Symmetry: D2
């Protein structure tokens, strides 16, 4: 339902790579207003969460966001933003993901690293 | 407008301290589903961005999220979550914030540090 | 033994709290030169690693640094710096620590959060 | 001079890219003991500091580490470790760097992202 709230679309999934995009609307903007940094981060966390889910037996394990960090580089004002999440490390109890979030003009909006716990 | 989307309420503001709460609803949940880690981080980013705005001349300067990091500790399934943002460093071009996000039971859900750029 | 290299001294340690100091010498400086940010981080990581070791059965488990993040706030040019590590979360498989590093003048040099994995 | 302590060697520099390596000795180990995560981070921070220095006029400006974060992935017990720092963003007042640190066996030891302030001197 956060995916629904932000109108996210899964553009591509394969083992160790997830691409998720969303429209930059007023509902995800800050007051100034650009795309809220947090909304970008939430898109990124969604991407690597779904990636980790795709790599495990979900009847036995659950992927939980453990650590997230992010640098905000450029602003987004309109159109769409796209998160590309690529796995860096696929461990037994943790996955580490590199995420880049770009705008329509191919500009880096947010660059991010996410650590997902794999829990029983 | 992200604040309205997440149904946030500013519970308290003073120089260097911001408290913002929001309900844990399905629209901010992960599928499994607990509170989405991204939504929690967005709450934190909202709090320190508002804090920084309160500390600066809103007509000469603008606060932009520059870096955010967060550790997810406990899950939230319902009720309200509350972010408490305390300033660590009030510099000329950067503010650094410590933010703690707790659930109803006073459990630490998410702990976070945010660096806000102060721009002309 | 990085402890020796940097001339670290354990000033206090009790359950969930570690204080470690070290001199700001040329061997830990950047060229310019201030205290190297990395040396400061290494002091912090040392403090929380030790803390975690003190909290667990070291005949069965080992504490491994999993994630570290840090904000450099002020410079140090001389004297001693002191890292205070306080535990935020003492989990079964992870510990999360908050670490503050100050200079002689009680200024914040570096603020840090560290996640330590508890491994068999 | 933290460079000397750790016996770091600059293997390669060009605009936006720095490679620095160093031997895994007892003086940079943890007790247990593998390469200390802090020493690994310090190598990384050195790499992006040097990268930023190479991109700016060092007679007017100084590069200061502003924020660093890192994930420790695998351990290093011996031989050499190598930090490759590639620039992500070269702004006027900040640089953002990606750093990867590998061992001899091409294993990721530490992966790292660094924000460097460009300050007037």
């Amino acid at each position: 339902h956060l995916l629904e709230t932000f109108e996210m679309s899964i553009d591509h999934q394969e083992d160790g790579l997830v691409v998720i995009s969303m429209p930059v609307t007023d509902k995800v903007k800050q007051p100034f207003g650009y795309l809220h940094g947090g909304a970008s981060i939430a898109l990124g966390e969604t991407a690597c969460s779904l990636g980790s889910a795709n790599l495990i037996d979900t009847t036995k394990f659950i992927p939980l966001g453990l650590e997230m960090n992010a640098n905000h580089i450029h602003s987004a004002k309109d159109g769409r933003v796209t998160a590309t999440a690529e796995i860096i490390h696929r461990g037994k109890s943790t996955h580490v993901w590199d995420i880049k979030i770009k705008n329509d003009k191919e500009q880096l909006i947010t660059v991010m690293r996410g650590t997902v716990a794999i829990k029983p």
